[PDB]
Structures are given as C-alpha cells and as structure tokens.
C-alpha cells in the first residue's frame, strides 16, 4: 500500500494513532505484520505555485 | 483436558497507570496447572508474563514487566487478578491469559490451553 503524508504527521500515522488522518484516513491494526516505507518527496508531489 | 478461562477486566490506563486484570477458572484439567498472562507486544511474539502456582506458593516476574506487574489470586472465587504498579506507556497491547497445565513450568514455550486476550492501551 501507497499513500504520502505531512511530516507533522510522522507520528500521526502509527498503529494505535488518533486524528485526522490516523483515525479519519488510514487505519494500523495493533498486530500488524510488514512495513512502512516514508520517504519525502518535495520535488515531486508539492508545486512551487 | 478441557478447560474453559474466564478472564475480565481492562479499560484505558494511562502512562503510570495500573490495572486489576482477573482470571476466573473453572473446568477439568489433567493437573491443577498455573493460570497467568501469556501476553505478546503489539506486533511482537506471545511473551510470558507473570506466574502465579494454584497453591499460591510460586511467583514469577521478567525483566520487561518487573517493577510494574504483579499476579495474584483470589482466595473466594478463585479468579487470578494482575495487580498493578505505575504501568509504563509502552504496554498497548494485548494480554491473554493462557493456562499451563503441568504442576512445574520448566519452560514456558509450551502452552497447554489459551484464553482470552485483554486489549488495553496506555495514553492520555
């Protein structure tokens, strides 16, 4: 699975993590098994307009 | 053997923070086994907790949960609580109260009968 988020947001998107984007976008169960890769990419998904 | 585990209790806790888990137990066994947690780290692998013996003679606690766990068990009702002591903000996980059916735990690999699991997590 894909997704991009914020950096303020690294901590937010967490097995057992709440807010807007823990709760309301992207859910980990407690026992989850595999990884998550977060890389920034400023370059490309975020316009200098 | 067949053996049926009531096991109750729970909630939120918070960073030093304390449970009063419970474990009633109930059915036949092969051996009067030794009731306790059999809890793993959210993600982790199943870890043994805290033992508490049926005659309430034998007690066990690990590196990772001393300081801030303790078993016992009721002498009424025969319900096993885990009595708390400043719980840190790194126990959300899930605890489940396996039964050990043989009178000494040589090793706590082997599990005879599982029980219940207890999902409580630590924040404010």
């Known amino acids: 699975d894909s997704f991009v988020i914020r950096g303020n947001e690294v901590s937010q998107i967490a097995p057992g993590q709440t807010g807007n984007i823990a709760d309301y976008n992207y859910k980990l169960p407690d026992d989850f098994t595999g990884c998550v890769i977060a890389w920034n990419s400023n370059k490309l998904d975020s316009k200098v307009g | 053997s067949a053996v049926q585990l009531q096991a109750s209790g729970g909630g939120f806790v918070q960073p030093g923070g304390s449970l009063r888990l419970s474990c009633a137990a109930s059915?036949?066994?092969?051996?009067?086994?030794?009731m306790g947690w059999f809890r793993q780290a959210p993600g982790k692998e199943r870890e043994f907790v805290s033992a508490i013996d049926w005659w309430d003679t034998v007690h066990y606690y690990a590196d990772s949960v001393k300081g801030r766990f303790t078993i016992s068990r009721d002498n009424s009702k025969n319900t096993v609580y885990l009595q708390m002591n400043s719980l840190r903000a790194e126990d959300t996980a899930t605890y489940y109260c396996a039964y050990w059916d043989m009178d000494y735990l040589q090793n706590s690999i082997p599990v005879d009968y599982w029980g219940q699991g207890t999902q409580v997590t630590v924040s404010s």
């Open positions: 059915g036949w066994a092969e051996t009067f086994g030794h």
